Design a protein around this ligand. Structure first.
Ligand SMILES: CCCCCCCCCCCCCCCCCC(=O)OC[C@H](COP(=O)([O-])OCC(O)COP(=O)([O-])OC[C@@H](COC(=O)CCCCCCCCCCCCCCCCC)OC(=O)CCCCCCCCCCCCCCCCC)OC(=O)CCCCCCCCCCCCCCCCC
Ligand SMILES: CCCCCCCCCCCCCCCCCC(=O)OC[C@H](COP(=O)([O-])OCC(O)COP(=O)([O-])OC[C@@H](COC(=O)CCCCCCCCCCCCCCCCC)OC(=O)CCCCCCCCCCCCCCCCC)OC(=O)CCCCCCCCCCCCCCCCC
Ligand SMILES: CCCCCCCCCCCCCCCCCC(=O)OC[C@H](COP(=O)([O-])OCC(O)COP(=O)([O-])OC[C@@H](COC(=O)CCCCCCCCCCCCCCCCC)OC(=O)CCCCCCCCCCCCCCCCC)OC(=O)CCCCCCCCCCCCCCCCC
Ligand SMILES: CCCCCCCCCCCCCCCCC[C@@H](O)O[C@H](CO[C@H](O)CCCCCCCCCCCCCCC)COP(=O)(O)OCC[N+](C)(C)C
Ligand SMILES: CCCCCCCCCCCCCCCCC[C@@H](O)O[C@H](CO[C@H](O)CCCCCCCCCCCCCCC)COP(=O)(O)OCC[N+](C)(C)C
Ligand SMILES: CCCCCCCC/C=C\CCCCCCCC(=O)OC[C@H](COP(=O)(O)OCCN)OC(=O)CCCCCCC/C=C\CCCCCCCC
Ligand SMILES: CCCCCCCC/C=C\CCCCCCCC(=O)O[C@H](COC(=O)CCCCCCC/C=C/CCCCCCCC)COP(=O)(O)OCCN
Ligand SMILES: CCCCCCCCCCCC(=O)SCCNC(=O)CCNC(=O)[C@H](O)C(C)(C)COP(=O)(O)O
Ligand SMILES: Nc1ncnc2c1ncn2[C@@H]1O[C@H](COP(=O)(O)OP(=O)(O)O)[C@@H](O)[C@H]1O
Lengths: 88, 104, 459, 320, 347, 98, 54
């Protein structure tokens, strides 16, 4: 069979993994509710790179209008859950 | 539609007595029904049962039971008229039997 | 023998050329005429059988079975035409064609002189029954029932085919006369043991033997009324007839090869009689009672005594008639209330007195009241078993008690008490139903006056 | 000699009958536009055979006597009650749409058979290519479900790919308010209920999907409401078209032979309409199916093959 | 395809088979096989699609490998005896190569994997041809060399073919794969008796070909290739479904139908040679084939499945093309059991 | 036998194993088929020359002709497969299962 | 009361690509209605060549 039934916890873990692999983010000061622009001090261009890393990680494209809304890891997890139809 | 398929509703069974108060339960057509009842009754109760039972009761004695009784009567009379035993423990004549010569 | 076979074949174009409203009348009339003609085979010679030709012969064992089949066909037609009223003309003609083909295969099966022809017809009986069950059965379980009925039979019958061809190769013939006259003892060897098993298990599963009987409740409950009639009355007797024909060449091995089958039959007749005491479906009770009666027949055949074969033949005939009558009685109530649950409709004696009388007579014949032929066969088998071993009387008496218990339980549950209030669609009994019950019951009582017609060759 | 491989081997060919005036033409347009009059005029002028728009009972016109059959034995759908109750929970809307697509497929097969067998051209009102505008309008108005659209798309994908598109696509352009005004002036009480959103959806589907799609493999002639009464001008415009665009020039005797084998044998044409996809709107149960099939077989001339029904006057049956 | 080209290719296939039939020289038999394959490859691809291309490629690879093994065996036999005549091979190793080659050509287990896929990937006419005509030549070659075969290997392959045919047919919803597994089981039955009586093999071949022709023609008439598509035929052609049900019962080997006679004759012939266990296992395993035939009959004729609304339009049209031999094939597939003693004419 | 006979027989066996074991390319297997044919040609020619059987000197030529027919057939099938998928890999031919 | 006949749910048991669906074969999809798979977007890249300057 194909991949197991991906859940919210795995999505959140993968998102935090790819964010902690990003060099311009503090590994321990980053939280699921941290704001990139305000909490992490990231620039808009930095955010675009992060969205691109998410697209590489989860294997599906993200349009710009959706990406502009995504301003924290929790929003990224929620967007991935909505696009992949994951309830838990 | 909240429905799965286009199906006719299950109809109610129709009483034969409703259109024919004396309908015999054979057919919807009263004439065909009456003649079905008549042929069933005539060819079952009149032809098969009674005539066939008479035929079986008066079957000739092909089983040879009266003949067997008469033969037994003759044999018994002949045997006790001479003092012979009524029956032998040997069904076949020992003189036409050739047993193995040695038993040891 | 052609004077019976050819009219049965002529029944097919006659019903295919009939008008849409005359098929039942024509088929019933000519089936009754064919039964009347077949009634002439009861004249038996005593010493030997009636050998019409190289292909067919008649015996004192075959003749009652042939008469029973020919008599059962018109009763099947009478029972079928009520629930098939909404059917198209072509499908009704196809149903009647299935019935006629089944009759033809049955009448040819009981008269074949040679065992391969008997096997071919005895397997050929499967197809019409399977088609009837799976096409005109009412519920969704008819498919599973048909699969069970087919595969239980075939798994036993194929080794019989292998054994028969091997036996013909080794002996040079399978003609029943040559088989009987040139009989030689079977030695005590594994090869002979497996030959015995291959010759026995097909007829075992057709009876059915307890432990191989699971197909019977499914098939007998899920079939239409005519299918149940022919399954209980005639098709169960194929195994017994085959056993009586085949055990001629199995001696002296049967002396100890029959022990597990005797044990299974006695304990399983007890088990099925007990099962009948707790049954929520009316047809399943009749099916399990059939299983018990056929277990008693299996014991009678296994013990290999003249009294046992006489009792077995009488019990086969009586059980066929009684089981057909009971199935028709259940079907009438099912047609009234469209449910097989026994406690749904109660106190039917208040609403249908004559049908209650038919129920009482059928229940009395089921429990083998004297001097009915049911008790004639059962008593002969019980005496033969007592001669075989005095300890069999315990199981025989227990089975008698339980049989009376569930027979009267069914009668009391269906006919006595007070009627169900909300059920208000119970119409008076039709002439067809009463005539069908009378035509079932009257030959049973008439056979009491001449019991030697159904006692078989050993008489 | 019925046409087949034997007929093709000895003699019979298709290209020898093409005479530059075959030109499968479809005259499409929105509801109540004068496309029918224009199509009939074009057929009369150019000398082509005219095909009136395929309705619910089109198949009835071609089999047995040309008389229509009862609605429950043919179609099992009503256009009037679609106008009355388009959202009814009995599935009438998608059933009507699928039956109309099947009827248009049958009509396209008949027209192609005529053109390939006689060489004379044909003129069609609508086609299987433009049938989807009504489906899209129904779906956008909430009249049918997404699954109905998917089933329609599957059927179209497996059916419409077997045939050649029309040479000329004529579109009669009428603005939606004029369509509505013609609708009230007509007089049909059911068509009074057609909303403006439905007509707008039909027109948008046309102008955004059908014309751009056909413009890639066919040549399109658009005409306004006022300039559509000039049949002579339209015919002159058609007569000066260079059909050098679609797959028709890429056709030789073998492809024509395959297409002619396919257009006849209407059962092969309709094969993939009754695919076992169990949508509630179009699925019919065993009991109703049996009853309706028996009733159809009880029709006066439908029990046997055409030349074998003696109750409609067939003779010499015992020697046929 | 041009009809003339198709006729030429069919005639070339038939002429290659006849060349295998009439040859006394091993090289000519190899040539017949080569010509048969060469003309057969395009016929599988008459209706072009990727599935047909894949089926043709798999068929070509399998048959080319079998032909290479065939030629290698012929060369070994020539090496150990300067003989080209097909009488009886003089080397056990060459004979084993020959058997493996002919079994691969027939599709016997465990060389059965190509049959279901190739059958599924082609049309019903190509499937009919592949499952009827393609069996004649290797079976004729095996009949000519019957006295030389090793009974152990042949009987092992036959038993494996029967078992695998039953098990594989148990799992199919596509009709072509069902027919392919049925063909595998029937080939196993045929090759089980070949070391004992070639007349029995010929009789089984004739009856199986008749039943398969009738079944494929009935499947073409009701243009269905899946179980659910065939479930609709009752609402348009009940007679076709009834004939299909009777033919399916015949294919299951039930008496008194025709399909029973080859199994009966094979069992009795094997018992003449003191072979009891294997025919018993063979029949008990053919029970599986009967089971999936009965499942198809349940879904097709004995019960009525739901239908669609568009079937009403199909009700108004007859069949444009009629199959001339379908009526005869059905009668021969069902009602020929009483004519059993005619098999003596086959020897 | 001469040891050359064993060498040619092992050449046939190696080519047969190479055909039976598949890598990604379809073309490699066609070459293995051609190698089996070449080994058959060599072996048959050696056997015919050794025994001086004059009339079968033409048999290997017929073998070569039908080898060419086989190679043409395989190349045509490879053309169609590669046109379908853009690659001659065998793992693309998996639309049909058992 | 009428004889039971198969319905959509019963009929759907035979609509899968294979009977007895397992975990591995659950992702198998039935073949297309006609035996035609949709063409793959395996675009064959043209060869790019520098013609000149030398
Ligand atoms: C009904 C509707 C509801 C539902 C119905 C359900 C039923 C369905 C039935 C279906 C059909 C069945 C068919 C069966 C066919 C059967 C045929 C058959 O086998 O017949 C055999 C048999 C015929 O024998 P046979 O083999 O022909 O004999 C030939 C002999 O060699 C030579 O014999 P013979 O030379 O002695 O000749 C005698 C002769 C002449 O005999 C005499 O006349 C002399 C009699 C004495 C008279 C003396 C007084 C009179 C004269 C003096 C007075 C006047 C002058 C003086 C005046 C003085 C004034 C003061 O008459 C007879 O032969 C006897 C009569 C035969 C009648 C047979 C009728 C059978 C009918 C079959 C079908 C029935 C269908 C049902 C309808 C039936 C019709 C209603 O008939 C009988 O068995 C009769 C039985 C007699 C029994 C006697 C008493 C026995 C009691 C013992 C038990 C004690 C305990 C209490 C038990 C009580 C039990 C009742
Ligand atoms: C033993 C007495 C002898 C009398 C001589 C005449 C007997 C002629 C009877 C002919 C056979 C009867 C036919 C049975 C079908 C039912 C008929 C019917 O529907 O009724 C309509 C008719 C019209 O009434 P309704 O006002 O419209 O409403 C009726 C309601 O439905 C509700 O009405 P229901 O609640 O009153 O039910 C009707 C009746 C009818 O239901 C029955 O169950 C009667 C059948 C008896 C049981 C059957 C299976 C048991 C095994 C015995 C087999 C014997 C066969 C012998 C040959 C028979 C020839 C056909 O049920 C009963 O009366 C209670 C049944 C208890 C019977 C116990 C007898 C045990 C064995 C006795 C000895 C047997 C061997 C005799 C020789 C022994 C050594 C000397 O009613 C009657 O006529 C009543 C029938 C007369 C009662 C017969 C009881 C004993 C007779 C047994 C066989 C005769 C042997 C003759 C040889 C010589 C002695
Ligand atoms: C004994 C064993 C038991 C029986 C054997 C097993 C039976 C299996 C047979 C399967 C045959 C397959 C088949 O033909 O179609 C399947 C067909 C199903 O197809 P369909 O759905 O009806 O529609 C297909 C259409 O044809 C769609 O195709 P179409 O649109 O292109 O229609 C073209 C059609 C219409 O045909 C035409 O258009 C006629 C035009 C004539 C063109 C002129 C061409 C001539 C030039 C070529 C010459 C080549 C010579 C070779 C030289 C070799 C040198 C070594 O032609 C055909 O359909 C095929 C023609 C078959 C030719 C038969 C002639 C016999 C050749 C004998 C060769 C032996 C020579 C001597 C050998 C010496 C040894 C070396 O099956 C049936 O129709 C019923 C089954 C009948 C089987 C036979 C009955 C049992 C035996 C009696
Ligand atoms: C509803 C109202 C009920 C009240 C009315 C009741 C009226 C009175 C009822 C009581 C009648 C009692 C009758 C007692 C018997 C008297 C006649 C008897 O003696 O004859 C018998 C005759 O019985 C018949 O022989 C046997 C019956 C045959 C049954 C065949 C039925 C037809 C076939 C139907 C299909 C069967 C299917 C199953 C078959 C296996 C015995 O014959 P047997 O003493 O020797 O003959 C001596 C003289 N002979 C030999 C020269 C004749
Ligand atoms: C649910 C209902 C299904 C149907 C029931 C069918 C019943 C079939 C049972 C068959 C009855 C007995 C079979 C053979 C008779 C004796 C068997 C054996 O145990 O007896 C001894 C045999 O000795 C050993 O026990 C050998 C048998 C041991 C191996 C058998 C395995 C039994 C385990 C039970 C498995 C269940 C079988 C049924 C499966 C459903 C006798 O000793 P011996 O005198 O020296 O041998 C006599 C034979 N000779 C003359 C050829 C030498
Ligand atoms: C060594 C090999 C020996 C071969 C023996 C073959 C025995 C013949 C019986 C074949 C039974 C096959 C049953 C099967 O494969 O599947 C079980 C089946 C699957 O259902 P489907 O209809 O296929 O799918 C529905 C959902 N889509 O599940 C069921 O419910 C089965 C119901 C009917 C089973 C009938 C079995 C009756 C067996 C009687 C006893 C004798 C059997 C034969 C062996 C005897 C013992 C030696
Ligand atoms: C639906 C449930 C019904 C199940 C009934 C199945 C039981 C059938 C009885 C056994 C079947 C096989 C019998 C074989 C046919 C007999 C022919 C014969 O006698 O040949 C024997 C051959 O005997 C055998 O080969 C028998 C071996 C068993 C093969 C298959 C075994 C399968 C299981 C057997 C035990 C189960 C049978 C009873 C179980 C009943 C149902 C539970 C001797 O021949 P020769 O080789 O010439 O020997 C003398 C010269 N040396
Ligand atoms: C392998 C070696 C590669 C090296 C070669 C690379 C050459 C590519 C150079 C291309 C240059 C361009 O495209 S020029 C891009 C076009 N214009 C601009 O960049 C200036 C106007 N933009 C703004 O002022 C925004 O506000 C912003 C400041 C971005 C804030 O962004 P956020 O606050 O929203 O994060
Ligand atoms: N595919 C379709 N779906 C729904 N309705 C259709 C379809 N085709 C035609 N109709 C109906 O046909 C009716 C009138 O047809 P139309 O050609 O537009 O007018 P006219 O009769 O003047 O030519 C309209 O009410 C339209 O809804």
């Amino acid at each position: 069979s194909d991949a197991p039934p991906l859940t919210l916890e795995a999505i959140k873990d993968r998102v935090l993994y790819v964010l902690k692999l990003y060099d311009k983010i503090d590994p321990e000061k980053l939280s699921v509710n941290s704001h990139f622009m305000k909490d992490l001090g990231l620039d808009s261009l930095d955010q675009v790179e992060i969205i691109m890393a998410m697209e590489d990680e989860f294997g599906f494209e993200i349009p710009d209008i959706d990406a502009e809304k995504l301003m924290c890891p929790q929003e990224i997890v929620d967007y991935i859950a909505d696009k992949k139809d994951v309830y838990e | 539609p909240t429905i799965r398929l286009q199906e006719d509703p299950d109809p109610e069974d129709e009483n034969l007595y409703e259109k024919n108060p004396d309908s015999h339960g054979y057919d919807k057509d009263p004439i065909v029904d009456l003649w079905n009842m008549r042929v069933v009754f005539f060819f079952g109760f009149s032809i098969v049962l009674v005539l066939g039972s008479t035929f079986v009761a008066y079957l000739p004695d092909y089983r040879m039971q009266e003949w067997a009784r008469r033969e037994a009567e003759r044999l018994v009379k002949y045997r006790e008229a001479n003092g012979l035993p009524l029956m032998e423990s040997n069904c076949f004549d020992p003189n036409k039997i050739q047993l193995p010569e040695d038993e040891d | 023998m052609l004077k019976i076979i050819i009219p049965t074949t002529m029944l097919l174009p006659m019903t295919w050329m009939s008008k849409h409203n005359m098929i039942w009348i024509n088929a019933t009339v000519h089936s009754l005429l064919i039964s009347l003609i077949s009634l002439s085979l009861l004249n038996q010679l005593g010493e030997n059988s009636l050998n019409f030709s190289l292909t067919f012969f008649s015996d004192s064992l075959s003749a009652p079975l042939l008469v029973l089949t020919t008599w059962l066909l018109p009763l099947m037609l009478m029972a079928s035409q009520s629930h098939l009223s909404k059917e198209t003309t072509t499908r009704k003609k196809l149903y009647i064609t299935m019935l006629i083909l089944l009759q033809l295969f049955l009448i040819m099966t009981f008269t074949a002189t040679e065992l391969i022809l008997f096997y071919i017809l005895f397997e050929a009986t499967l197809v019409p029954t399977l088609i009837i069950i799976t096409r005109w059965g009412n519920q969704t379980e008819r498919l599973n029932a048909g699969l069970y009925f087919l595969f239980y039979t075939l798994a036993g019958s194929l080794p019989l085919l292998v054994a028969l061809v091997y036996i013909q190769n080794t002996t040079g013939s399978l003609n029943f006369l040559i088989i009987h006259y040139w009989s030689h003892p079977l030695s005590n060897s594994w090869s002979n043991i497996f030959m015995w098993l291959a010759c026995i298990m097909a007829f075992m599963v057709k009876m059915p033997l307890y432990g191989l009987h699971l197909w019977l409740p499914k098939a007998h409950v899920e079939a239409p009324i005519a299918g149940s009639m022919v399954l209980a009355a005639v098709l169960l007797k194929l195994g017994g007839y085959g056993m009586m024909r085949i055990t001629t060449i199995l001696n002296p091995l049967t002396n100890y090869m029959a022990y597990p089958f005797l044990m299974l039959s006695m304990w399983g007749m007890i088990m099925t009689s007990s099962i009948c005491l707790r049954q929520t479906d009316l047809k399943s009770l009749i099916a399990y009672s059939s299983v018990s009666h056929m277990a008693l027949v299996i014991v009678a055949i296994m013990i290999q005594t003249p009294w046992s074969f006489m009792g077995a033949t009488a019990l086969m005939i009586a059980h066929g008639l009684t089981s057909s009558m009971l199935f028709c009685l259940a079907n009438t109530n099912y047609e009234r209330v469209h449910s097989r649950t026994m406690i749904l409709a109660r106190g039917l004696q208040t609403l249908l007195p004559l049908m209650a009388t038919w129920w009482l007579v059928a229940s009395l014949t089921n429990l083998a009241l004297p001097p009915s032929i049911n008790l004639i066969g059962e008593l002969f088998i019980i005496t033969a078993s007592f001669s075989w071993s005095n300890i069999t009387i315990i199981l025989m008496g227990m089975n008698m008690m339980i049989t009376a218990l569930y027979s009267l339980y069914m009668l009391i549950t269906t006919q006595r008490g007070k009627y169900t209030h909300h059920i208000n669609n119970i119409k008076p009994s039709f002439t067809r139903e009463n005539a069908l019950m009378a035509l079932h019951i009257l030959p049973l009582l008439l056979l009491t006056l001449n019991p030697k017609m159904i006692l078989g060759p050993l008489y | 000699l019925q046409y087949g491989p034997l007929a093709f081997v000895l003699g019979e060919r298709t290209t020898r009958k093409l005479t530059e005036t075959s030109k499968v033409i479809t005259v499409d347009g929105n509801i109540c536009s004068g496309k029918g009059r224009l199509a009939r005029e074009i057929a009369e002028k150019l000398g082509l055979r005219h095909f009136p728009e395929a309705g619910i009972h089109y198949a009835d016109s071609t089999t047995g006597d040309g008389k229509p059959l009862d609605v429950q034995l043919s179609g099992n759908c009503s256009l009037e009650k679609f106008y009355d109750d388009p959202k009814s929970n009995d599935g009438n809307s998608y059933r009507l749409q699928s039956w109309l697509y099947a009827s248009r497929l049958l009509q396209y097969a008949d027209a192609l058979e005529h053109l390939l067998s006689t060489g004379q051209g044909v003129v069609l009102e609508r086609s299987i290519y433009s049938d989807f505008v009504f489906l899209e309008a129904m779906y956008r108005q909430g009249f049918i479900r997404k699954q109905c659209v998917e089933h329609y798309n599957e059927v179209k994908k497996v059916t419409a790919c077997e045939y050649l598109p029309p040479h000329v696509v004529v579109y009669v352009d009428v603005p939606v308010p004029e369509i509505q005004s013609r609708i009230q002036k007509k007089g049909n009480p059911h068509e009074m209920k057609i909303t403006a959103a439905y007509l707008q959806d039909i027109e948008n589907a046309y102008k955004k999907t059908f014309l751009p799609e056909m413009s890639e493999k066919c040549e399109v002639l658009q005409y306004s409401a006022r300039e559509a009464e000039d049949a002579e001008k339209v015919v002159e415009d058609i007569e000066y078209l260079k059909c050098d665009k679609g797959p028709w020039p890429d056709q030789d005797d073998r492809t024509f032979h395959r297409l002619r084998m396919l257009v006849q044998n209407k059962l092969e044409v309709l094969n993939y309409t009754t695919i076992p996809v169990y949508l509630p709107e179009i699925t019919i149960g065993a009991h109703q199916s049996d009853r309706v099939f028996q009733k159809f077989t009880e029709l006066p001339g439908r029990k046997y093959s055409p030349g074998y029904n003696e109750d409609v006057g067939d003779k010499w049956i015992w020697l046929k | 395809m041009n009809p003339i080209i198709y006729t030429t290719l069919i005639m070339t296939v038939m002429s290659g088979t006849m060349l295998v039939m009439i040859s006394s020289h091993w090289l000519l038999i190899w040539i017949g096989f080569e010509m048969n394959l060469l003309a057969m490859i395009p016929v599988l691809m008459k209706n072009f699609n990727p599935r047909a291309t894949e089926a043709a490629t798999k068929y070509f690879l399998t048959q080319a490998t079998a032909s290479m093994m065939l030629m290698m065996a012929i060369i070994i036999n020539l090496l150990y005896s300067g003989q080209w005549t097909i009488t009886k091979m003089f080397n056990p190793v060459a004979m084993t190569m020959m058997t493996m080659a002919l079994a691969m050509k027939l599709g016997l287990s465990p060389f059965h994997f190509w049959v279901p896929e190739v059958t599924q990937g082609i049309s019903l006419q190509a499937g009919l041809l592949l499952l009827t005509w393609q069996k004649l030549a290797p079976l004729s070659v095996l009949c000519q060399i019957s006295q030389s075969i090793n009974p152990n290997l042949m009987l092992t392959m036959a038993m494996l073919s029967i078992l695998i045919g039953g098990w594989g047919g148990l799992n199919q919803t596509q009709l072509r794969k069902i027919m392919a597994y049925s063909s595998i089981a029937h080939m196993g039955w045929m090759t089980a008796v070949l070391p004992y009586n070639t007349t029995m093999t010929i009789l089984n071949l004739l009856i199986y070909i008749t039943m398969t022709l009738a079944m494929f023609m009935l499947l073409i008439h009701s243009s269905a290739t899946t179980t659910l598509s065939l479930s609709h035929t009752w609402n348009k052609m009940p007679v076709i479904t009834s004939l299909m049900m009777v033919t399916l019962l015949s294919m299951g080997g039930l008496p008194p139908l025709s399909g029973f006679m080859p199994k009966w004759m094979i069992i009795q012939e094997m018992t003449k040679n003191e072979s009891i266990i294997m025919p018993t296992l063979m029949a008990m395993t053919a029970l599986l084939n009967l089971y999936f035939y009965m499942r198809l009959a349940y879904s097709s004729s004995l019960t009525m499945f739901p239908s669609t609304n568009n079937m009403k339009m199909k009700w108004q049209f007859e069949h444009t093309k009629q199959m001339k031999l379908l009526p005869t094939m059905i009668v021969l597939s069902t009602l020929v059991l009483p004519m059993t003693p005619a098999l003596s004419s086959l020897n | 036998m001469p040891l050359v006979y064993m060498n040619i027989i092992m050449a046939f066996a190696i080519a047969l194993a190479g055909l039976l074991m598949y890598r990604s390319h379809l073309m490699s297997s066609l070459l293995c088929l051609e190698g089996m044919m070449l080994s058959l040609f060599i072996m048959s020619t050696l056997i015919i020359l050794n025994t001086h059987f004059t009339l079968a000197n033409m048999m290997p030529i017929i073998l070569l002709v039908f080898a060419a027919c086989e190679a043409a057939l395989g190349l045509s099938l490879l053309v169609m497969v590669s046109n379908t998928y853009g690659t001659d890999y065998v793992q693309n031919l998996n639309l049909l299962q058992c | 009361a009428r004889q039971w006949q198969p319905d959509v749910e019963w009929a759907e048991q035979f609509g899968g690509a294979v009977m007895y669906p397992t975990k591995e074969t659950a992702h198998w999809k039935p073949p297309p209605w006609n035996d035609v798979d949709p063409p793959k977007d395996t675009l064959v890249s043209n060869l790019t060549l520098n013609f000149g300057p030398q």
